Amino acid sequence: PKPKIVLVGSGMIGGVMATLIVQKNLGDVVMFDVVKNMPQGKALDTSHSNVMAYSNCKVTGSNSYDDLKGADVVIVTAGFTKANRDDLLPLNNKIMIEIGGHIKNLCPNAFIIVVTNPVDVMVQLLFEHSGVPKNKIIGLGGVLDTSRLKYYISQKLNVCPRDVNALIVGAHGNKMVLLKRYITVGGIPLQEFINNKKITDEEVEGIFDRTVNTALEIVNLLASPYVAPAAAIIEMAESYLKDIKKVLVCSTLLEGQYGHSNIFGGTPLVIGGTGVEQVIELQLNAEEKTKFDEAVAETKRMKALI
Amino acid sequence: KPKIVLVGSGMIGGVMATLIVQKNLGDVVMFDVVKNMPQGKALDTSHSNVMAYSNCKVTGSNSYDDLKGADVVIVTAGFTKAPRDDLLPLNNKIMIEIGGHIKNLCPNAFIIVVTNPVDVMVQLLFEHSGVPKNKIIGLGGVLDTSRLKYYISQKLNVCPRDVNALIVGAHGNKMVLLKRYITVGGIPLQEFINNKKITDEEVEGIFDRTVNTALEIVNLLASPYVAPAAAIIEMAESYLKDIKKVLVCSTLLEGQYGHSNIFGGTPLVIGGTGVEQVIELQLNAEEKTKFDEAVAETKRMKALI
Amino acid sequence: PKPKIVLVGSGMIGGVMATLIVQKNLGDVVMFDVVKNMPQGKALDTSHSNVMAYSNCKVTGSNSYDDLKGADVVIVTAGFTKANRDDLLPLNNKIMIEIGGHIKNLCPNAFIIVVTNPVDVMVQLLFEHSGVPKNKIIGLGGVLDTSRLKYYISQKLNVCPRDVNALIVGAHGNKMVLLKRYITVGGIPLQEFINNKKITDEEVEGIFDRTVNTALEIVNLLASPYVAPAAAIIEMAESYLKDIKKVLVCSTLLEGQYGHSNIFGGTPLVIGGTGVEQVIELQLNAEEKTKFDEAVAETKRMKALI
Amino acid sequence: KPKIVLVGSGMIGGVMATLIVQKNLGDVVMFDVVKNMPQGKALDTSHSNVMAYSNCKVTGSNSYDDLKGADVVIVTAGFTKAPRDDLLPLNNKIMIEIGGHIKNLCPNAFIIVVTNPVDVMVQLLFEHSGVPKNKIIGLGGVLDTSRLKYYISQKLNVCPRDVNALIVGAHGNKMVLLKRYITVGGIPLQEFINNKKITDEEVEGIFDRTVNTALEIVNLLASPYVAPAAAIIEMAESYLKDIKKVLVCSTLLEGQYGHSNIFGGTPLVIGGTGVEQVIELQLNAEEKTKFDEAVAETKRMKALI
DNA sequence: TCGATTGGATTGTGCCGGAAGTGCTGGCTCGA
DNA sequence: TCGATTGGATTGTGCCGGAAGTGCTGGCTCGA
Ligand SMILES: [Mg+2]
Ligand SMILES: [Mg+2]
Incomplete structure (x- = not known):
């Protein structure tokens, strides 16, 4: 029963x-x-x-x-x-x-x-x-990576961390694709906050880099990331077990999305009682799609080395 | 305590x-x-x-x-x-x-x-x-947007809280439903419209339903009070626990959207000191026209006390 | 799934x-x-x-x-x-x-x-x-009735309501059996608090009467009890749905316990994923058993009037 | 905050x-x-x-x-x-x-x-x-009793929190396990012993296991820290939210149990002002003897700083 | 003979005890 | 003809609208 x-x-x-x-x-x-x-x-x-x-x-x-x-x-x-x-x-x-x-x-x-x-x-x-x-x-990938991005933005803007939304796709790891276009704060585009000089483009780029570099930053401080990874995983598992149907960015089998097949990659998904209920394909522009391509290429490169 | x-x-x-x-x-x-x-x-x-x-x-x-x-x-x-x-x-x-x-x-x-x-x-x-x-x-925006978020979430089969939306100006029939600011899992609603997962017409229909929700509930011989109470407690809790949630509420306008000496609905940050930020949305001309209409109705009624 | x-x-x-x-x-x-x-x-x-x-x-x-x-x-x-x-x-x-x-x-x-x-x-x-x-x-019976008793005791002694434990058995309603012997506070017998003059026997009797009279007290105040009843019911349902195996006093089929059969009455039960997993029979003394008998007799009396 | x-x-x-x-x-x-x-x-x-x-x-x-x-x-x-x-x-x-x-x-x-x-x-x-x-x-009693409560609950097949128990005197090998004060769903443990659902011998065995739990965990190549952290946070939370939980903790004795100028484990009420009540258990002669032994060990060690 | 699972306390790290004290290594068993 | 589910907003209470304003009743449909 349990x-x-x-x-x-x-x-x-x-x-x-x-x-x-x-x-x-x-x-x-x-x-x-x-x-x-x-x-x-x-x-x-x-x-x-x-x-x-x-x-x-x-x-x-x-x-x-x-x-x-x-x-x-x-x-x-x-x-x-x-x-290596x-x-x-x-x-x-x-x-x-x-x-x-x-x-x-x-x-x-x-x-x-x-x-x-x-x-x-x-x-x-x-x-x-x-x-x-x-x-x-x-x-696991996007829930963790975006938790870093969301948190850092939230601290610069002094709002609740959960009120920042952001998408990071393609792959977990150094080739992760940070989508500046898709960041919102309380539902409001980040660009409005940049326009109002609450945060600069430079600061945003710094936060992107920090997001990419977070695991290394924690290890260099003689610690290891395990609290946020565990919380991210449990958020995923709970969405399955309780049929919550949260939108969560995770690694899933691509069947033509973003122009790729026979490979797993990070994309927004809906996790419900039947597992992955929806795979959402973002309408990326050409530059974003190039970055996604590069992430998938690195996954393939490593897959060939088993 | x-x-x-x-x-x-x-x-x-x-x-x-x-x-x-x-x-x-x-x-x-x-x-x-x-x-x-x-x-x-x-x-x-x-x-x-x-x-x-x-x-x-x-x-x-x-x-x-x-x-x-x-x-x-x-x-x-x-x-x-x-x-x-x-x-x-x-x-x-x-x-x-x-x-x-x-x-x-x-x-x-x-x-x-x-x-x-x-x-x-x-x-x-x-x-x-x-x-x-x-x-x-x-109270206004948290309740009205809870309706909008819920209805959209049921059309797209996602968690209700994963829909984000802003309704501003006033709490009442002139509420300003900002279609441009709706997202699902952080993704612009326009992407779901492009994919035909939901239509412009269905979104307008849900806007209508949102505006008329209290009436819909009363027509069903009930009185809206559960969701209003929950909205109020979300606001109060953001104050009491210093959470700094972004919540749309009615606040004193001091030049925002071109209005003063009047309260209107706008996204706010609610934390331990109270309203810590009043966020002015960068509305376009049409949206601003709607906001003006909402505030004009509040003013009209204020004249009748 | 849900x-x-x-x-x-x-x-x-x-x-x-x-x-x-x-x-x-x-x-x-x-x-x-x-x-x-x-x-x-x-x-x-x-x-x-x-x-x-x-x-x-x-x-x-x-x-x-x-x-x-x-x-x-x-x-x-x-x-x-x-x-009537x-x-x-x-x-x-x-x-x-x-x-x-x-x-x-x-x-x-x-x-x-x-x-x-x-x-x-x-x-x-x-x-x-x-x-x-x-x-x-x-x-439903004991979880609600004992919530009243626990709360009133807790307020007199200035402790957390949940830290008071108490058992009320037999039947829901005016014949409910309040078991003074079985009241504890933070796991400590109530009698220690009476001995220390933190509460008197008189005050305890007053709290017993108030427990019995609570529904009437609320109705006389032009309200109706529904918040605590709902919370009690949901505590029961949740113990079933999540297989918590809480000990909860509820009405259940008696098959010889307390000397009664073919009748339902209030007794501590364990509620888990298979439903009622245990029916616990309290080792009542003669006076307590007489009170239980009277509760069951009233249930039977009313059952005959359908 | x-x-x-x-x-x-x-x-x-x-x-x-x-x-x-x-x-x-x-x-x-x-x-x-x-x-x-x-x-x-x-x-x-x-x-x-x-x-x-x-x-x-x-x-x-x-x-x-x-x-x-x-x-x-x-x-x-x-x-x-x-x-x-x-x-x-x-x-x-x-x-x-x-x-x-x-x-x-x-x-x-x-x-x-x-x-x-x-x-x-x-x-x-x-x-x-x-x-x-x-x-x-x-910290002492909340952790030690969490072990005792858990072990008993698994023998009786009930929710762990529905077992209540007091362990007093000191946090260490001389901890005083008060068999008379154990309840299950509010019911004296003695009733479950009478019904043979658990025996006196099994309770003594669980007492031994409780005393030696840190050692048992270390023998399994782990370090006890999850339950200790949870116990500490239960204490801290009772303070921060003014819950007034009854929690067994080490506190200054000022004549309770016949001891002064020393800290020992006893049930306390923890609320917004801190320790709001120190509850002195009405121990019998044997229990008091055990309490005395626990405090005597604390004193013995205090002499060696 | 010779190394020891994808993990870890304080330290390191096959395990287990003693020593020193913000802190590791010597002496052991098991089985490839 | 005549009553109206085990429920309820502000008021009462089959429903539905207007009136008055910490606040109910007049006029209607449905179906036994
Ligand atoms: Mg290893
Ligand atoms: Mg009726």
């Missing part, structure tokens, strides 16, 4: 996700990791927070892929991140193959969210080896 | 008190000139603290004395008419009375005016209460 | 329930009433509040019992309340028969919460005519 | 900052003596305002100067040891330093101390900060 959420990967992001799931009473949680005992420990700690949250989510740890059985949602964060980053692609491909095989056998009706980087490659690899329908698997 | 005084404990007051307890926003005084009724509603509501895990006192009052020390005052009191100018003098008197009490008892309160016609009444209460211009606003 | 909640009765309590369901994003709502148009109007108003709540619940009105089809939860508030109150029993019995027939045909797997008074009679009548399992139908 | 300063930005600090943003409770300063790290964590956390619909500033600091104007200060800084007395002098020094700064910069702040051994450290910080006795408490 949803089963399996976290494939119980690292930094996995931990925060389990915490938020208990806070929101969203479902039972399996914290899976190939590393022995650690996820069981994290699960034990997290389970006690049910009391403070007035929730009732079972939180367990697992080192067995057999616990994917009957999952309603599967969130994949596991994979190599440390020692391209060198990690064949390793993580192998991991995606393994996971895919289990999903196919044990929870083929699950909704799958992929986080492992580079996400636009990894999500397609898992799609190919899991056999799940295209409307049932997406990758 | 904040003190919220509801001047008027009718059906919208009831829902407001319910939501304040749900959100644990502050202690509540339910005031009404009707004897005993607000005490009864307050008693009922107070028990819901248990279910909500909250701790808000909820009391009823027939005395304006209980305005003392209010942090927020929400005025819904006043004569109503189902969807005329005859309400203007009567309700003027009420604004005078309430105003005096605010002036004497809670001059630092943040005031939200709901009494219709709201764009007139909020200015009257502003004048008679003596509060600063950044500390008093009128 | 739960379907059908409110059979769209009066004062129904209205607040629909409002709270949207606030909590708990499910789609059908506001049913035999009265034409009114529920459609209330539904239209309530639906707009989805925007303020960041929810996505469809709220519709209905004058057709056919809309019970596929209900996951059915909440019955409809029935005569106005012109016993005179209303045969009328409301007829209503329970009608409703029951539709549940049997259209949503036999629904979880049913009965509110129509006198609830301990009405809930059994609906049980008998709906054919639903005994673990799938309960009546 | 409240200012919350986290003195210590380790793993428990991270979860605290995350929860404060989720609950929109106030602006957050993540302080640490470790350079750059809290700035990075704060930057990460700040973005989650968007997902949470909140507006809490989250900044990082390596300067005690940013204590200025804090409404709440949560101290987790200090040397740790996995589940000895050698921590006592070292952490004493830290309490002195932090204390001085509080005294100078936020003397009206509400202080929550977590640094172990907490019942000693909270008293040291009390002494060196000069804050009133009702404005400083130590």
Whole structure:
């Protein structure tokens, strides 16, 4: 009766996700990791927070892929991140193959969210080896990236962060396409605020660069991004589990949109109870489309290196 | 802990008190000139603290004395008419009375005016209460746009809150529905029109429905009060928690859109100090014409108090 | 995918329930009433509040019992309340028969919460005519009554209302059994607070009487109780829908507990995803058991008058 | 809007900052003596305002100067040891330093101390900060009882929060687990024992597990910080929103249980003025003996700073 | 013989204990 | 001919409009 959420990967992001799931009473949680005992420990700690949250989510740890059985949602964060980053692609491909095989056998009706980087490659690899329908698997990207852009704008303009809307498309990572044309504040075009000298074009460009550079900025400060990534993922999962039909930018299978096929890329989607209910194709101008093309080209380049 | 005084404990007051307890926003005084009724509603509501895990006192009052020390005052009191100018003098008197009490008892309160016609009444209460211009606003845009957003969202099959829209000028039949400023998930509505997911004609139809929603509800033998209460609490909460939401509300115009000495609906930023920013939209000529018509109607009615 | 909640009765309590369901994003709502148009109007108003709540619940009105089809939860508030109150029993019995027939045909797997008074009679009548399992139908009583007791105690002692716990059993209504022995404050027996002179036995008796008399107190003040009843009902429904397994005092079929069978009465229950998961029989002393007996006797007396 | 300063930005600090943003409770300063790290964590956390619909500033600091104007200060800084007395002098020094700064910069702040051994450290910080006795408490009972409540709830198949329990005296191996005060849905646990739904032996086993939970987690290669952070935020929130929850925390004893000049765990009421009530449990002789043992251990360690 | 999962406390990092103290390494088992 | 669903705005209350103004009733349709 309660949803089963399996976290494939119980690292930094996995931990925060389990915490938020208990806070929101969203479902039972399996914290899976190939590393022995650690996820069981994290699960034990997290389970006690049910009391403070007035929730009732079972939180367990697992080192067995057999616990994917009957999952309603599967969130994949596991994979190599440390020692050229391209060198990690064949390793993580192998991991995606393994996971895919289990999903196919044990929870083929699950909704799958992929986080492992580079996400636009990894999500397609898992799609190919899991056999799940295209409307049932997406990758994390736009919700996180746009949360950075929205937040920075909101702080310059002194408004509620959620009241800034913005779209970032194409791919997660350094080739992300920031669409200046599509930024609004309380529903009002950003350009009105630029005209009123509340923010300059220069400052906006600085905020674009900071958005692109945020992960590196956090790592250079001897931290790692996992709170905002976890919150973004849980926003996606919750939109599925509660059939909210939020418009969220995620990585999805392109079937001709933006002139590309047989590749995943970031685009606004509607996430509801049946999974991806709508794929929205933005009416990009030529320059924006060129940037999208470049993002997709980089995804393809890396896909060839598995 | 904040003190919220509801001047008027009718059906919208009831829902407001319910939501304040749900959100644990502050202690509540339910005031009404009707004897005993607000005490009864307050008693009922107070028990819901248990279910909500909250701790808000909820009391009823027939005395304006209980305005003392209010942090927020929400005025819904006043004569109503189902969807005329005859309400203007009567309700003027009420604004005078309430105003005096605010002036004497809670001059630092943040005031939200709901009494219709709201764009007139909020200015009257502003004048008679003596509060600063950044500390008093009128309900309009949050409610009207909640209707517009909802109807569009159901045509496009998306989350209602993911539609954004601005309705300005005045709260009433002359409300200015700004088609150019509608977005869905941050995307201009024009893109959905181009893709034939919705038409210009359907958008105009939804504009008409939005304008006439209170009438539509009354024709169905109901009274609009749930959404109005929720809109008011969204405003009050943005103040109490310093959220700095952009919310369209009626505020004193000081030259914006070419108008002064009058209140009108415009996007505002609501935070801990009250109205922190009044945002003037860069309207084109046609839009400005519509805004002018809305303000002209407010002025016309103001002449009849 | 989203739960379907059908409110059979769209009066004062129904209205607040629909409002709270949207606030909590708990499910789609059908506001049913035999009265034409009114529920459609209330539904239209309530639906707009989805925007303020960041929810996505469809709220519709209905004058057709056919809309019970596929209900996951059915909440019955409809029935005569106005012109001896016993005179209303045969009328409301007829209503329970009608409703029951539709549940049997259209949503036999629904979880049913009965509110129509006198609830301990009405809930059994609906049980008998709906054919639903005994673990799938309960009546409102204890959550509401104890919310009054908890609140009044909490105000005298100046603590959080939820930190007072108390049990009231037997029946909803004037024969409710208030169990002084079972009152705690922050987990601490009330008697410790009486010993410390924070509250007297006299004051406690006054609070007991006020608890019994609360509905009358509100009506005498020219109001009607519907906010707290609605919140209590939604707490019950949510415990079912989200499998929380809260301990909640409700009216349920007695099968020998407290020495009674073939009758419904108020007792602590556990409400989870399968409905009533546990019926907890309190270890009452002789005096308490006599009071329970008297409550059940009144329920039987009224049941004979349909 | 409240200012919350986290003195210590380790793993428990991270979860605290995350929860404060989720609950929109106030602006957050993540302080640490470790350079750059809290700035990075704060930057990460700040973005989650968007997902949470909140507006809490989250900044990082390596300067005690940013204590200025804090409404709440949560101290987790200090040397740790996995589940000895050698921590006592070292952490004493830290309490002195932090204390001085509080005294100078936020003397009206509400202080929550977590640094172990907490019942000693909270008293040291009390002494060196000069804050009133009702404005400083130590973490213990909310966390320990969250474990006890959870384990019992899973044996009886009920909602974890519906188990109530008191653990008093001290936060550590001498914690006093009061079997007589356990309830389930308000019902004495003894009734469930009588019905054989759970046994006396299983309750003693769960007591043992509760005492040793941090060790159990560490043996599983993890570190307890999620539940501790959640407990701390429940305390802080009861202060910030004036909820008046009954929460077991370490507080200055002034004759309660026969002890003075020492802090110990007891049920408290936490509201807008701080500790509004210190509730002395009416313990029997055996329970009192256990309480005495807990306090005697705190005293023993206090002698070694 | 020789390395140790896609994770991590304070430190590093196959695990486990002792030492030092804003802080890692020596001595061990398991199984390829 | 004669009453009007288990609900309700401001008032009452089958519905619908006008009047008066912290506030109801006159004139109508539908269908038993
Ligand atoms: Mg490793
Ligand atoms: Mg009727």
